[PDB]
Amino acid sequence: MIHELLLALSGYPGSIFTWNKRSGLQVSQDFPFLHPSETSVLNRLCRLGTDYIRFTEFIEQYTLHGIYLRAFCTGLDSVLQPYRQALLDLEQEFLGDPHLSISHVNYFLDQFQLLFPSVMVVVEQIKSQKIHGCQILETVYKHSCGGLPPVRSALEKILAVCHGVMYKQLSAWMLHGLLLDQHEEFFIKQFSLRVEILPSY
Amino acid sequence: DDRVLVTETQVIRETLWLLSGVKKLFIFQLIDGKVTVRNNIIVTHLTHSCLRSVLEQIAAYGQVVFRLQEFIDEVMGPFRTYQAFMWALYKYFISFKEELAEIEK
Numbered sequence: 001m002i003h004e005l006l007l008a009l010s011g012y013p014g015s016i017f018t019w020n021k022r023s024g025l026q027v028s029q030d031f032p033f034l035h036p037s038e039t040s041v042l043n044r045l046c047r048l049g050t051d052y053i054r055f056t057e058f059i060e061q062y063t064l065h066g067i068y069l070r071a072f073c074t075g076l077d078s079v080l081q082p083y084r085q086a087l088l089d090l091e092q093e094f095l096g097d098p099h100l101s102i103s104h105v106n107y108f109l110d111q112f113q114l115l116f117p118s119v120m121v122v123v124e125q126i127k128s129q130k131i132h133g134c135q136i137l138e139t140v141y142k143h144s145c146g147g148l149p150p151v152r153s154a155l156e157k158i159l160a161v162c163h164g165v166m167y168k169q170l171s172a173w174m175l176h177g178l179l180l181d182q183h184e185e186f187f188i189k190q191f192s193l194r195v196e197i198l199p200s201y
Numbered sequence: 202d203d204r205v206l207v208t209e210t211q212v213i214r215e216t217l218w219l220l221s222g223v224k225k226l227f228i229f230q231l232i233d234g235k236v237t238v239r240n241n242i243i244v245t246h247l248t249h250s251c252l253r254s255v256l257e258q259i260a261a262y263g264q265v266v267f268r269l270q271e272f273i274d275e276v277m278g279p280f281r282t283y284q285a286f287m288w289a290l291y292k293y294f295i296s297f298k299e300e301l302a303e304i305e306k
Contacts, residue, residue: 036227044223106221114291117278147281148284149288
């Protein structure tokens with residue numbers, strides 16, 4: 001069930017690792033090939049995977065519409081990359097030593113245990129309040145003042161890509177006299193100025 | 202009175218899990234946020250009572266690590282200080298966990 005576990009952590013559940021659209025990853029029942037008081041860590045480890053799938057299920061559907069939202073999605077693909085990288089590292093380990101235990105992966109995968117729950121709720125606010133427009137630039141910044149150095153350096157990267165859209169529309173407008181917008185995205189709608197959608201900082 | 206008659210090496214593995222902060226262990230079954238040794242554990246030696254003695258001490262250490270894990274849990278699931286305080290505590294646990302995990306090897 002070693003290789004069975006890694007695949008479940010990548011988005012492919014099985015019989016021993018059932019899937020639910022409401023709860024998420026969870027151990028099904030008791031198995032005779034597992035320790036009676038070991039199922040604990042697997043359920044805790046599965047909570048790391050349950051976040052991962054809801055990422056992809058949100059990414060693939062892209063669901064709300066707007067370039068800033070869509071570009072925020074691709075920005076979310078960059079931060080998840082070390083999670084894809086570090087998980088693949090274990091493959092070289094077990095093929096080398098086939099007798100490793102289930103405890104080692106928890107000791108290796110502690111850093112990602114903390115990053116997701118802080119960034120996962122950032123997605124929840126968007127799906128629960130319909131944050132449409134440039135206001136996404138503030139919701140990512142409002143949590144950018146977080147205390148955790150890794151969580152700060154993660155959303156920092158998304159901001160570094162999310163601004164990649166604003167700078168472009170800002171450049172094509174402040175230099176050529178036309179605006180590239182069709183969904184009430186830019187904060188400039190005889191033109192006027194918008195304050196209730198203007199960024200915070 | 203019946204007893205389970207566990208082997209010897211199995212205890213050390215269980216003790217390592219208690220050090221790790223994991224719950225729901227065949228030994229050290231907590232009841233009210235207070236880890237407590239079971240009553241039917243016995244080895245071929247150690248007359249069934251010294252085992253209850255030696256485990257009772259390690260249990261006292263489990264309380265120190267179980268309560269802290271309960272604290273870190275109640276922060277993950279904008280104070281900016283407790284949240285910044287656990288990150289120091291959390292950082293210490295990872296390194297401490299590595300020494301315990303290595304022994305299991």
